[PDB]
């Protein structure tokens with residue numbers, strides 16, 4: 373008997389030790405666009421040294437012009453409108469804001485905030501139904517109330533910020549709609565591999581998208597979760613492309629590199645190491661799922677297939 | 686028709702603009718004693734330069750050795766124990782912890798904390814009854830909950846701090862009684878002159894004290910409110926001492942100077958200026974009250990007398 377299979381390590385952590393305690397500022401709104409903004413039409417760049425990749429390697433771009441995806445960090449409502457306008461210049465299909473944040477978030481007087489718990493795990497362990505209910509209740513309770521919104525500084529703790537009596541509350545769905553984007557939420561936990569339920573949900577959603585749909589993925593910082601779903605999308609839509617090519621190109625347009633690399637972590641961040649290794653293994657396992665289930669049109673859900681073909685550390 | 690008389694300027698401020706937003710750390714517990722600790726038996730020191738006083742002036746100490754009062758900043762439970770043991774060496778009478786804080790405060794896992802709003806006015810405008818009810822409710826609601834406790838830093842906003850799930854909650858009353866001290870609460874608003882009700886309450890309390898009672902006054906910092914009541918007590922108990930000597934001596938044992946001086950605040954603190962001036966005028970008005978009503982045994986209280994003898998700017 374195995375208590376938690378590879379891919380579900382986070383289930384072993386105790387939600388009660390990471391409860392939310394502050395409204396974290398998700399973006400100061402100073403730039404025109406959110407951070408790490410990138411699209412599948414972008415030129416590839418030299419790889420980051422930390423990943424020890426082959427700078428001489430030239431990844432195939434097969435399928436990228438038709439991929440129609442982008443990624444970024446969280447944003448203010450104005451920044452999202454700039455994103456939507458830029459994307460509208462690349463397509464005539466519907467543009468989706470794919471919100472990958474399990475953490476409860478929204479907009480207080482137009483300011484993008486999130487209910488932050490240690491490691492950003494305030495909704496760890498909650499079903500998507502429970503996470504969205506927490507977010508709705510929490511946002512609604514902020515209206516007409518005095519709140520403290522602050523960015524994190526020294527050691528993931530509030531630093532400075534501001535106090536205000538909220539006069540307007542909005543969900544991301546409303547902000548997305550106000551920007552001309554369709555909205556789709558996948559409540560993925562920060563820093564770890566998306567769960568079987570997150571991916572099953574994504575896959576069912578992907579199946580019914582119109583051909584010209586454009587997917588704009590985003591999390592809080594736009595690196596981990598955002599690149600994982602960009603990679604999954606690239607694998608699903610371009611199954612003939614090699615794993616190496618998918619991983620290099622998604623990294624070289626500005627995303628994370630999801631292949632093996634020398635993991636290094638500050639002492640205070642040593643807890644992340646096993647999550648990074650798990651992600652490497654699960655990326656490979658998902659590629660395998662795509663290669664072995666595409667011919668019959670994915671009759672078998674990812675969650676079911678994963679349980680019959682467990683990943684190995 | 687005057688909207689607010691001198692001595693009640695604070696009533697013009699709007700409570701809704703200073704609502705509490707964070708559990709402020711009241712003392713880091715690093716020292717054996719609370720800050721600004723001082724007793725009426727202490728030697729007089731040179732006056733602080735900012736008050737532009739006469740360093741060569743030697744105030745009369747008449748009655749100081751029998752005064753039996755002390756003052757300090759807020760404290761951890763251990764620090765209070767140290768205070769109590771130290772005061773027990775000076776008397777055989779009851780030792781009172783006289784809590785002058787209107788702001789809701791208490792102890793979380795033994796940590797002295799307060800519900801802080803801008804200017805420390807989270808309870809501005811509440812009656813003492815409502816202030817104490819808010820306090821009891823907020824303390825109890827913290828039990829078994831995740832809370833954020835932080836010291837204020839730059840701009841009087843949270844800086845660093847800690848997060849924990851509270852396993853113990855106590856009011857200051859419990860902490861005082863466990864330290865072997867009697868407890869008396871006067872809900873005085875931070876930074877301003879105490880209200881006619883705060884003072885009527887103190888004088889009725891003073892009237893019930895056995896002659897050997899020792900009064901240990903304290904607020905958050907141990908300066909404004911603490912010194913005001915120390916002065917009032919000095920005036921009540923030593924009515925033949927000149928106003929100048931009371932003011933010089935309460936300052937020279939380590940308290941605030943409540944006489945006239947060239948008020949110079951930082952631009953961010955200019956709101957303080959009129960409250961300082963108001964304090965200087967009320968100090969004098971309270972002294973008149975004592976001089977005019979002590980001979981008949983205070984048949985008429987301060988609030989009443991004040992209304993028929995209004996202070997003037």
Ligand SMILES: [Cl-]
Nearest residue numbers: 499500501569
């Ligand atoms: Cl779910």
